[PDB]
Design a binder for these strands. Structure first.
Length: 63
DNA sequence: CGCGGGGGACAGCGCGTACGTGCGTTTAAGCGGTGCTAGAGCTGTCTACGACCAATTGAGCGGCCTCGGCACCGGGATTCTCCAGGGCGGCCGCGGA
């Protein structure tokens, strides 16, 4: 079971950890940084998706 | 591509005042000094704290297909605006005694 589920997320956090690791950022990557990134995705995508739905109900379109 | 035209771009000149420049006299900074002490900082350190692959694993995806929604006119007073008479801002002028 991925560690995102116990933290309130869904990610396989190792995927983002690999992305940062192969991204030529730093030799040591903090373990909590990908988790905070996943939380940032969750909430920023929440507010942006609610903006998208806001403008969708502005035209009564379900898509 | 073409034309009517009319609201809008562009200019000429007066207003006048709004900065602009020349008079004195400041309020507060620059510099010399200082005596400290208060923050910035690497060295023994040592530990905890991150990385990666075995057993599993779940989890989101790869692919289709239903169906409650997309697109907009039948269906249409009102909105949005445009244009012709009426009473009027009155304005104004001119003349008997």
């Amino acid at each position: 079971q991925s560690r995102s589920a116990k933290a309130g997320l869904t990610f396989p956090v190792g995927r983002v950890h690999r992305l940062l690791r192969r991204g030529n950022y730093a030799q040591r990557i903090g373990s909590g940084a990908p988790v905070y990134l996943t939380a940032v995705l969750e909430y920023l995508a929440a507010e942006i998706l609610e903006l998208a739905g806001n403008a969708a109900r502005d035209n009564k379109k379900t898509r």
